[PDB]
């Protein structure tokens, strides 16, 4: 058992169904940042991919996470989407 | 619980040169406390690199804490 | 748990033999008085009846020979802060208040004639001219009222400092035109029938320098003065500065025998010559002891102390001459220059009639 | 502090300074500065006064005196010495209090005095690379960058325990771009790998794994 | 004063670990450097540690 | 004419070259006396000295300046009504830079400047005099000295044009005062300009809160009496009319939540207008947007006041804006403290959406450390990003530790020695260490304690304590405990721990309530003489629980509190017993506004032996005195001892006469001295009602109540049958009650408690103490 009162862990970008349906193939990179807000995570190792992660651990022991990975070609145009709506654990 | 309330009037001792007597005080005080009792007291104070130092002589009218030496510093 | 401090160290009561034996002929208590509240509540006279009031609101009319009252009315709800000089003319007594009321009373029986709101507290005494009552309020507004109704005929607005001495500056009239003081050092004048503006003049640099004091006008010369300001003389027709003195003033002044009699901010008394700021004499004695308005009575200038005494000064000589009884809790408002008579009201509500 | 009819206050005060009687030095230098503010004993005096404040550990006053000097004479021919003392005064504020006596590695305490110090020494050696001080200043800079990186790791360590996995990755990435070559960055790469793994971001986890596995000794 | 251990001059800032830049594996690059940058090597004859005379210059004016 | 050279001598403040470059015409220029005079004007513009002589007698000009003492030291003759640092900083801001320049004109200026300052604070009577003396090397020393009266008393504050409310009710809410009564004489007539303005805002808000939406403070003025020692304040009101509020319409770019925004803005159409209602309603809107992460919303409320009827409709316009993310948290000034020691206790999460309430909840929790004098805060947007914020907390390290030592004396008391050292935030680790130690002629005490409030990152505190406590009945005791305390909810703390304690009782007086225990422990001491000892080792499991949702914290109005603690020994102890405590306080309001309240407090205790042993008498419960039931001497409510006769007693018969002194009693002495019971049941019901003398400036701070108390303590296994002659302590029905008044007062010298209580129901030996005093209950 563990019962100690943790505050709600929350991390990353906020996600909602009406915000993710904005993204579609071929948008320019500034349009994505305008629709969803700025990416709080990106690949620093020299490939232009943004990791919109939405994560919460509400209350006692519940856990939830959505991940939305966006891949851009050079000059900042979106090529592919990888949306996982729930933690694949 | 312990409770103490005290009031005091100052009349410094010039035993030492004014220069060193600037860092010195002498005071006369009355207090009431429940532990109910009332008391009157004489106090000498000095300051040093060790912190502040007090020597005090007192009489509780309910008669004892009649003679005290005290030091108290924050770090 | 307490402490106190002082600066001015007022004069140690200079004193002299009471040569002319001036003393109370009669005295009456109307009630409470102004007490500590500086406010120009003072008694007045008409047709051998003297009228007086208590700042709580209660007002009385007294016979000047013996001091027995004939009235009592409350002017109040079931205090009024009745405040400002009592003024009397013919059928009516007029009184101001610190509660924006002006009251009119019937001189025949003391019944309340009419009551009308004015724009703010009426610290000025009312003044009656040309069939109108003029009142100057603390909001810097002259208001002219119909004497049978108090209905406003016209109103005029003056500039208000962010900090002032009390704005009494009661108006005066000549040739059918009014002249008035005001805060921020302004003298001004207006046409009595309609409130049209006439010339205005800035008494001094301004830091307080309110012209809080009623400007007397004689032969067409207006005299005006201010706190840390300058005494000035003014052409009623143009407001040209005839002359000035760096002597300031604090409460009141009088012209009689075309000679000027003053009280300085330092509670010293002096007489100035017909024109130009030069003193015949100065009585530097009473320094920093609040002096009432000086009244010329039967050839002697009488001034009341903050405490109980009345000091008697010669009309033209530089002599301090007599010192009457220590009257109850002293004075804080101007005696009345009654013809052949004296009446003064002490702080506590005791009124005194004085003879020699 | 004393009456000084003669400028001799500067010679005997130098002797007190050579003796390390810092008390005497600052008080006589302050007296000389106040009494002779515009003579030759002014620039000649401000430097010794700065040095005495530093050795007296009177660092807030040392900051003010150094700041005054650079403002009043930005081109003095030994201004590089004043920059070196700027960095050393700021670096002396970092090692505050009784820590180290108990062995407390205080490298987690507020780094701003360290980060300032790094700016000062780097400004020096970029400006005056021929100066004698550049060897020490570069030794001071390598320690100051490692001390900053240990701070950043310390926060990455805390958020690893709190499980704020975005707060981990976003800071250890910050170390890789601001502090790449320090040992503390090499110690942080496991926390980045862990954080990506807990977030199911395995691709990034493998990438950081490839980095660390190539760079481990 | 609390800094008395520090202004008397510790040696302990020497023998701090030497810097060593990471080398990226094939198929990626490390992040581009963005601050607190690598200091120019500027090696020279200048003294170091307690050998450095911290006092003001050989003539003070 | 052309000048080939320029002569100067002196140059004490400024060199010739600096003058020549400052001068408009220079060596080699065509010049004439007008140009030379312009150079003298340039000398005056740089401002050396006004006295100069100039001569032309050739191709060179001679000029000399009459240098005169100017380089000023400043001193003031003390200051009875302003602080030394404020005085000197006002002087320096006014312009007298020490050692720059000083002149007789500047002396006049600074005099008037300090005068005007003194008048600005309000001691309008004050006078300032400044004097200088000259010193070699162009130096002067400047002394200034002050005279003042008492700062002026405000006379009658008066409001005019008001009709909805009486003047005395309006000015009573001011912080300026017309009158200070015969009581609460701590008030004062000190005028303050900034507080007068605040008092106008209070007058405006009061009328808006009463619903006069058309209200306007059209004008105000302040006046000073001729003797410059008394002030008048007068305020003009245009009241307009009382207004009724129409339903709120909300519009603009609400980023969802509109159904909740609606619910938050629903108001019945019968209510009056109310200023604080709209501002409180507007504040909830922006805080509600903040909670969802719209940290910088834009909101405006516009009243559509009607004139044809007394109705007003609020229009509220909202847009949510961007959903800011906290990209960094920084702590600055965090010297001598581990950063984790702050981050662990600050609540907002880095790398997540900015809940501005969570940032402020952090600021609160950092203050609850007490480590910091102040916790300032800022949030700042990163340059070149529209969307991301750095949060920074700026702290001043409070000097958290304390160190103490002391000595005492007196022939009637003996030597006394005391010591102590405390440091919350030990080396910045956030551990709290604390050592204590005391000795007198007789008692010895020492304590060492450690708490680690974050043994687990979720805030599981772990504590550890050692004690030695040695007294002469004679008792040497020493022991240890270690505890875990971890919150299970916001309202609901829980804790657990293990302890060890050793006891070495000796020379205790023979008495039934104690001997019964010893016989139960399998010790058979003498009953006849005061020579005995009973060493034991004990091991315990300690637990407790604490529910606490009291609303107001200081003087709660509503909610409840329930503390529970208990002990069992664990097998291996010499003692085998358990005890339990329940300790509760419920508040319920009995008016809709929280003016009237009633309390019900209770305590229940219990303990017993296990396995045929018995609960040790030193753990027995006590009742009576301010904590429990009022009107009885503290702790004296329990069953009183009965001693066995033991005429071989303590040494001296000249002392206060014992039971069975050398010449004393021979039967069981029914004592007057109280002993606790193993059982306890206290209740009090307490009605809270405001005084006949309230005003809202202090009615929140003088909590007065009427109370009914009901206490008992009993000794559940006192075998009354065998002791026919002595009053039954096993009977729980000996309930003893009292009533009285209580007055809880928060005034600066402390949270005092006054009480008077009458014991309308008591038994023999209950020492009464009707009047009682306490602090901080």
From Swiss-Prot, chain A:
One of its GO terms (molecular function) is identical protein binding. GO terms for cellular component: Bam protein complex; membrane. Disruption phenotype: Mutants show minor defects in the assembly of outer membrane proteins. One of its GO terms (biological process) is Gram-negative-bacterium-type cell outer membrane assembly. Keywords: Cell outer membrane, Lipoprotein, Membrane, Palmitate, Signal. The keyword Membrane applies. It is a lipid-anchor. It is found in: Cell outer membrane. Part of the Bam complex, which is composed of the outer membrane protein BamA, and four lipoproteins BamB, BamC, BamD and BamE. Forms a subcomplex with BamC and BamD. Monomer in the periplasm, but is able to adopt a dimeric conformation in the cytoplasm. The Bam complex has the shape of a hat, with the BamA beta-barrel crown in the outer membrane and the periplasmic brim formed by the BamA POTRA domains and the 4 lipoproteins. The intact Bam complex can have 2 BamE subunits. Belongs to the BamE family. Part of the outer membrane protein assembly complex (Bam), which is involved in assembly and insertion of beta-barrel proteins into the outer membrane. Nonessential member of the complex that stabilizes the interaction between the essential proteins BamA and BamD. May modulate the conformation of BamA, likely through interactions with BamD. Efficient substrate folding and insertion into the outer membrane requires all 5 subunits. It comes from Escherichia coli (strain K12). The gene is bamE.
Swiss-Prot record, chain D:
Disruption phenotype: Depletion decreases the density of outer membrane proteins, but does not significantly affect transport of lipopolysaccharides to the outer membrane. It is found in: Cell outer membrane. SUPFAM superfamilies: TPR-like. Pfam families: YfiO. It comes from the Bacteria. CDD domains: BamD (cd15830). Its main location: membrane. One of its GO terms (cellular component) is cell outer membrane. InterPro entries: BamD, BamD-like, TPR-like_helical_dom_sf. It is a lipid-anchor. PROSITE patterns: PROKAR_LIPOPROTEIN. Part of the outer membrane protein assembly complex (Bam), which is involved in assembly and insertion of beta-barrel proteins into the outer membrane. Constitutes, with BamA, the core component of the assembly machinery. Probably involved in transient protein interactions. Efficient substrate folding and insertion into the outer membrane requires all 5 subunits. Part of the Bam complex, which is composed of the outer membrane protein BamA, and four lipoproteins BamB, BamC, BamD and BamE. Forms a subcomplex with BamC and BamE. Interacts directly with BamA. The Bam complex has the shape of a hat, with the BamA beta-barrel crown in the outer membrane and the periplasmic brim formed by the BamA POTRA domains and the 4 lipoproteins. Belongs to the BamD family. This is Outer membrane protein assembly factor BamD. It comes from Escherichia coli (strain K12).
UniProtKB/Swiss-Prot annotation, chain E:
This is Outer membrane protein assembly factor BamC. Part of the Bam complex, which is composed of the outer membrane protein BamA, and four lipoproteins BamB, BamC, BamD and BamE. Forms a subcomplex with BamD and BamE. The Bam complex has the shape of a hat, with the BamA beta-barrel crown in the outer membrane and the periplasmic brim formed by the BamA POTRA domains and the 4 lipoproteins. The chain holds residues 29 to 89 of 344 of the full protein. Contains two well-defined domains connected by a flexible linker. The C-terminal domain may serve as an important protein-binding surface for interaction with other Bam components or substrates. In addition, contains a long unstructured N-terminal region, which is required to stabilize the BamCD complex. Only the N-terminus of this protein is observed in the Bam complex in X-ray or EM structures, most of the protein must be highly mobile. Belongs to the BamC family. The gene is bamC. It is found in: Cell outer membrane. It comes from the Bacteria.
UniProtKB/Swiss-Prot annotation, chain F:
The chain crosses the membrane at residues 402-410, 413-423, 432-439, 443-452, 461-472, 474-475, 492-504, 533-546, 560-569, 578-588, 598-608, 678-687, 702-714, 737-746, 748-758, 773-777. Pfam families: Omp85 (PF01103), POTRA (PF07244). Changing residue 777 to C: Reduced folding of OmpT. The keyword Transmembrane applies. Residues 411-412, 440-442, 505-532, 570-577, 609-677, 715-736, 759-772 are extracellular. InterPro entries: Bac_surfAg_D15, BamA/TamA_POTRA, D15-like, OM_assembly_BamA, POTRA. Its main location: membrane. Residues 1-68, 69-149, 152-240, 243-321, 324-398 form the POTRA domain. Changing residue 769 to L: Very minor growth defect. Lethal. Changing residue 236 to A: Lethal, protein does not accumulate. PROSITE patterns: POTRA. Disruption phenotype: Deletion is lethal. Depletion results in the accumulation of incorrectly assembled outer membrane proteins, including TolC, OmpF, OmpC and OmpA. Decreased expression leads to decreased susceptibility to contact-dependent growth inhibition (CDI), and decreased expression of outer membrane proteins (including in this study LamB) as well as up-regulation of periplasmic protease DegP. It comes from the Bacteria. HAMAP family: OM_assembly_BamA. NCBIfam families: OM_YaeT, PRK11067.1. Part of the Bam complex, which is composed of the outer membrane protein BamA, and four lipoproteins BamB, BamC, BamD and BamE. BamA interacts directly with BamB and the BamCDE subcomplex. The Bam complex has the shape of a hat, with the BamA beta-barrel crown in the outer membrane and the periplasmic brim formed by the BamA POTRA domains and the 4 lipoproteins.
